Design a protein around this ligand. Structure first.
Ligand SMILES: Nc1ncnc2c1ncn2[C@@H]1O[C@H](COP(=O)(O)OP(=O)(O)OP(=O)(O)O)[C@@H](O)[C@H]1O
Ligand SMILES: Nc1ncnc2c1ncn2[C@@H]1O[C@H](COP(=O)(O)OP(=O)(O)OP(=O)(O)O)[C@@H](O)[C@H]1O
Ligand SMILES: Nc1ncnc2c1ncn2[C@@H]1O[C@H](COP(=O)(O)OP(=O)(O)OP(=O)(O)O)[C@@H](O)[C@H]1O
Lengths: 523, 523, 525, 273
């Protein structure tokens, strides 16, 4: 295919035009005054979303060089969403600022490799300064503040997330799903979670979320790998007229003798999912037994001798809902038997009491923590479909932000922390002058999220940024009330993981993008 | 593919142009002076309909940004039709007015998120004021008034609905179907109803109503889930030359071993439907036995031992007509045996007399209420096909309005109730000035249905709105007689559920729509 | 031919596009760090300039509607120029700011008439506040400073204007001339000034200078209307035989005589410039007698019996130089004896003593003032005749701005005047929301000149404007050194008259043109 | 009529394109190894030259903005020409270098006013350094060498200028004339020089030479302004009867007399300067 080749500043301005398009579409969503973006969809209604990573994803430009620039910046938001789930807009704005100032410095004749090295050194030092400046999150009030700020200043969301972490613990699993009424509901129900993913990418359901959901699934468990399709066809056959979708949990699921013909057999009316089982050997058998008792099912094994052909619908487990994600697969609500679940929990407790090995004790304590924590389900209440999807996205952002806060810590919100750690790095120098210019580019870019928040407010960003730089500590500019105050005290907090990941990914991609002399694309 | 990106007022005016197109097409149908809209169809003749939601659904514009605006507003009419079935035009007009005034306020520099919060607060307070202002509906004369007003001032429709609710009770099921003569007929026949839906979306028949209809269906019932296709093929085989379409009622119907090959087997000459059975365990068995006795059929169970291979055409049930909807599945007329039906009703009555548990008593009383109420069938009489469809839509609107009235209540018709509760909210204030502007936007927009009704009359809407705001109570402007009078006394009543749902959905969608800075679509 | 109408917000947006183009072109040059604008000339080199007058006069757009919006803003900018002498860029920046925010508000649906009522209410309060804030400029140092700033920061021009100001006093007459030497020259000689313009625009010898400069001309004094040129035929014959320029002062000039003189001026056989007779009645006749005494001339009147045909070279007055401005004519170094001038001064002083009417007494007082004070002449000195003409124009408009500062006052320049006016009027409200929006438009638009100056300096206008607002009094941003401080301490001052007139005309055009709906023009052909 | 406004970096790049075109055309000829540039003449053969003045004077571009950037650079090149007498190509090459790097820097966002302040600061330091570096040329040998280099490396012209400079001293008057003989001639005769230009550009007999050369003319000396040509009517009659060119020295010449003399020169009846 014929390849158009652009060199130097031509390629750089086409890249910058694409970057500006994508990053402006993203940046109009930053801050509490940020405005939603309408995304067109053919299959459904348009989605009015404030989620930065979505706006980043469906930006695709006609100009192929501008398209390449937009894609490389879209990588920033995608990686930020992957690592943290929140702060994608901040990451994109930082990437735009680093790109803009670095391209200015390149037009000034400075070395782009040296600018990249300076940017990366400044960002490494800024990550260290954020780690120094980070404050641990606790008391369940900072959790509510983090949730509220992450959800576009929605205090109900913050309180609901705080109650969820108070119920299922700071490390328990919480699931956000579509609600039924106008109000959000909290359900601390019984379920299971395990860090495993789907085997094949063709298991992705109609939603683009990447997590496949099942309405009243039918659970099958196994520890020994079966051999032929005919040994497992009756189970499917039973499921084929059971009424419930089938989820299989095994050691490792193939593609040859399951996936191709399960795609070819049905057209997608009722979906069948297959997942890996965590652990290995005795531990894997223990978690399989626990999940089978939770769902009321049984585990097939060579020692037991019971076979899949002898398995019936009542023998195997059943759940109310299962959502499967690549990072972690969670069974939301399995009925089973409450008395049997309590007995299994107690039995695992005397297993803890009897066991003395550190590995056995820690894995059995993980078992009891997973069983006692359960699953927190949040019903996102909204009047219409698009309001439901927007509020669900905001609550998902709040959840990811609160998890990042409990994992790593919190800092001053509103880009104030980046301002402070940029001010603390004003003396940072590199091996040469070009690296110093790159460090200055990075430090100037760290001011960009704050100025963009203030721009979305409609105030003069420059005077507000200068005022904030004038103060010290967690002093910043509360955008919601348009007034200056202590960021911690009125509760504008940002997860240190979110900010650090956003800065790191924006730095890496932008420091790579400022260094391009040529671009090769199609005609 | 390539995505056009528009920002700020460009996107907002394209959105507003699309919204104006859709909402004007909808609003020319509002009020008793409202005029029908001709909808083109390729498969059939054009449909001259006054139903607002039909016009809203069929509006799809060439300009992609205007298309997104139209789709987002179309969601208002669709959700209003979903929740209430009437008042879609009022919902769309309210959505247009909120959008227009909110976009004016945004052009005035006000914060759109604050405008959304103000609108939502004002609408929450207005829903509370409607609940305070709502009057219960009773006496079967208010029912007739509600039916007449909901059906373009058709008094025969109101009286017929009043007679139907007098026959089958205020909670009995009523079905509207195509008539045979020029006159509408009322048939209080024996039938069954249960709140269950179709398993697969490919069961939707040629009509776009979403409810699949069967001409003289053949009924099959089951409580224990079968395993293989071969156990159930002979029944189909018998049905394959029975002459009647087959409806299966089971616990839960799969897609794998039924849906794919039932699509692949026939091309759609005679249709086969499968539905869920309400309840569980003993209750589900009780309803299955009741339905089998109503249709003259039998229920297969493990304890009985009678198998589907042994089942014949005479053993299974038969009905005159069945219409299946996602919300509720109703068997319209099942012949069975009248003496057997009476005996089953009596037996369930001594079951009530014997039972003393509150759950058992309430479910058995629901059973006797469902059996005694029967099914009211309304034959919509018209000379031609398009007149038949128009009158059927109007009678459907009247039915949904009367049901909403008995569920929730009635208020003054002609948008007077919204005027009154807007006047009662004139002192409502928010956290800041922009929220107050949003509250004023909502209050001004609540006048829009009345002004649109008066515009459809051809009178000056502003003087009529000012006159109506001048009075108090249920005083308003009768559009039909073009003169001022009491709404309740003159018979113009609106279901409080319809008005409340319309306001809520218009508020939610419009408050989301005024807050958009960017739009991303195709080229 | 046929004509194309456009109304609604479409006309307003075409108008707004045009005024944005023109105001961009001229606001590039605002301030001492004003970027150069190059006017592409049809012949030779293009003129590169920071003159907002030259840039504005040059702008005319291809689309008729945008063109004509630019025409409106350019015309009101030139109106502010002729009213004051400076501040076309300031006037156009203010006009752009007010018009932008106002048309945006009108597109938001607010009532344009109420919006204009808010605008002119706010600018009336601003004018009153600026009068209250104005500082007198009677001192010579601020006079030299404003003369410097007006002539693109030239201390020599301000110095020369300062010495001339000392020479002729507070309300004297100052006129610029060209000197042979490289050094600047200053002289004081008895002269005349009267406020009358030329009969025809073609009478101007130098269209770029804009004034009719005649060296050693013969001056004719007449109190009668020149209906026929046959009265001027012997005058033309005598002045052609003598061979000198001719100046005419008459009561009225009809179409015939003016047309014949215009034809003669295209012919190139005579240099004839005619002006009206200022004053009226007896005061007119007395001051014409004073002018005849100054130049040794004679006044011709129909009532007396004297006729214009009976004209001799001795009867007409003579002077060493005359200059006819747009609406002012001055006479330098008249031939007439100083003793006769002193006698006339004594006669009109006795007339003052016997005067009883206030109007007549003040007329006689200004007569003795113009007859006794005289005229100062500043001869521009430089090396090149080119820089001679640029410095002559600089002295001209600098002294015009200087007398504007003298007559009313002076305020700390750099745009901080309107900044302080805006800061002191934040509480002014309107009768409704629309007028309130108009108030807010005007108050936020009075900050446009300082922001534009700072933006031309390359700094961030927002932080500088906020710091200037935070400061009180004359504290602002020196653009020249790019440092903050008090303007009065560092001599950056603007006349109160120029800022007031620029703001008044900007608000006038913005209110008058916001309320525009229909825009009629010819088809593009 | 209506006029097109272009501002921003777009105007600067249009203008830079124009000055790049003009400076390319004239910088081809820089130095003694300057490549020939052929100006295509509307009549006859196209004139081929290494004269930067001749090449620059003829450049005008189709696009108005490129044209007008070229116009400005050409005008300042001619300003350096008539200010000095040589070095138009040097002036244009220097202008192109400074403008290229300057607009590149401005596109990098640096403040154009500060950038110009840097430029004129550096060139002021350069001017003072060059004055310090300058070597006096009072000796005749360097005078001959510079006269040679200026006239495209012609030793004879520099020689003739050397004997002329010796004849009239360091600040004397030297005037070039045409000689009939193939050999160069030099003479010294008492004469006059005064710094006054012609009233009208049409008075030049040879537009290519640029000077009004009159052989055996009648010279009139006047200390008064010629307001009317009737004063010059007897002078014109006498000089037409005698039949020689006419030179006029007067205090000032008004529009009437100058216009009449211009008309007379267009007539071809008298030679009046
Ligand atoms: N009231 C507020 N005042 C000041 N800053 C705020 C306020 N509320 C939120 N912020 C800041 O705005 C940012 C959150 O905005 P937003 O959620 O739109 O962006 P994000 O965190 O980068 O990611 P995304 O847009 O993908 O959710 C954080 O930097 C947060 O500190
Ligand atoms: N005679 C009347 N006088 C005044 N208002 C009336 C009269 N008849 C009906 N209305 C009002 O008009 C509205 C009903 O019109 P219409 O049925 O066209 O609209 P809708 O209820 O919003 O929904 P849809 O058009 O989808 O059926 C209600 O607000 C009702 O109160
Ligand atoms: N050193 C300075 N620092 C700050 N402001 C200054 C300085 N010198 C002049 N100004 C301001 O800049 C403006 C003068 O700009 P400029 O001379 O370009 O145009 P103008 O006076 O508005 O009018 P015109 O363009 O018609 O001559 C005035 O507002 C003056 O107060």
């Amino acid at each position: 295919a014929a390849k158009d080749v652009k060199f130097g500043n031509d390629a750089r301005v086409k890249m910058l035009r694409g970057v500006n398009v994508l990053a402006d579409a993203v940046k109009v969503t930053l801050g509490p005054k940020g405005r939603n973006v309408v995304l067109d969809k053919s299959f459904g209604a348009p989605t009015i979303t404030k989620d930065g990573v979505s706006v980043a994803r469906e930006i695709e430009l006609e100009d192929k060089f501008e398209n390449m620039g937009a894609q490389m910046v879209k990588e920033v938001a995608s990686k930020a969403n992957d690592a943290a789930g929140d702060g994608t807009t901040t990451a994109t704005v930082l990437a735009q600022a680093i790109i803009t100032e670095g391209l200015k410095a390149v037009a000034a004749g400075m070395n782009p490799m040296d600018l990249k090295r300076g940017i990366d050194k400044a960002v490494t030092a800024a990550v260290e300064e954020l780690k120094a400046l980070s404050v641990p999150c606790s008391d369940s009030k900072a959790i509510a503040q983090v949730g509220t700020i992450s959800a576009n200043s929605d205090e109900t969301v913050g309180k609901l997330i705080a109650e969820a972490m108070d119920k299922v613990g700071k490390e328990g699993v919480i699931t956000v799903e579509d609600g039924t009424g106008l109000q959000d509901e909290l359900d601390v129900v019984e379920g299971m979670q395990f860090d495993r993913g789907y085997l094949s990418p063709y298991f992705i359901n109609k939603p683009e979320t990447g997590a496949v959901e099942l309405e009243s699934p039918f659970i099958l468990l196994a520890d020994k790998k079966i051999s032929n399709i005919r040994e497992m066809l009756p189970v499917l056959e039973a499921v084929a007229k059971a009424g419930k979708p089938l989820l299989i949990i095994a050691e490792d699921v193939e593609g040859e003798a399951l996936a191709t013909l399960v795609v070819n057999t049905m057209r997608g009316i009722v979906k069948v999912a297959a997942v890996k089982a965590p652990g290995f050997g005795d531990r894997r058998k223990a978690m399989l037994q626990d999940i089978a008792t939770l769902t009321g099912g049984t585990v097939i094994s060579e020692e037991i001798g019971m076979e899949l052909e002898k398995a019936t619908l009542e023998d195997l487990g059943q759940a109310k809902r299962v959502v499967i994600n690549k990072d972690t697969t969670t069974i939301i609500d399995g009925v089973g038997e409450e008395a049997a679940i309590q007995g299994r929990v107690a039995q695992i407790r005397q297993q803890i009491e009897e066991a003395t090995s550190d590995y056995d004790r820690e894995k059995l304590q993980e078992r009891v923590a997973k069983l006692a924590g359960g699953v927190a389900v949040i019903k996102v209440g909204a009047a219409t479909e698009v309001e439901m999807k927007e509020k669900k996205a905001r609550v998902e952002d709040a959840l990811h932000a609160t998890r990042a806060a409990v994992e790593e810590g919190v800092v001053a919100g509103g880009g104030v922390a980046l301002i402070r750690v940029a001010s603390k790095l004003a003396d940072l120098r590199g091996q040469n002058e070009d690296q110093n210019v790159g460090i200055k580019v990075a430090l100037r870019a760290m001011e960009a999220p704050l100025r963009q928040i203030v721009l979305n407010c409609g105030e003069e960003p420059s005077v507000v940024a200068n005022t904030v730089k004038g103060g010290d500590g967690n002093y910043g500019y509360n955008a919601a009330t348009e007034e200056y105050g202590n960021m911690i005290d009125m509760g504008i907090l940002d997860p240190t993981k979110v900010t650090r990941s956003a800065l790191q990914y924006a730095a890496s991609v932008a420091g790579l993008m400022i260094t391009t002399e040529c671009m090769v694309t199609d005609l």
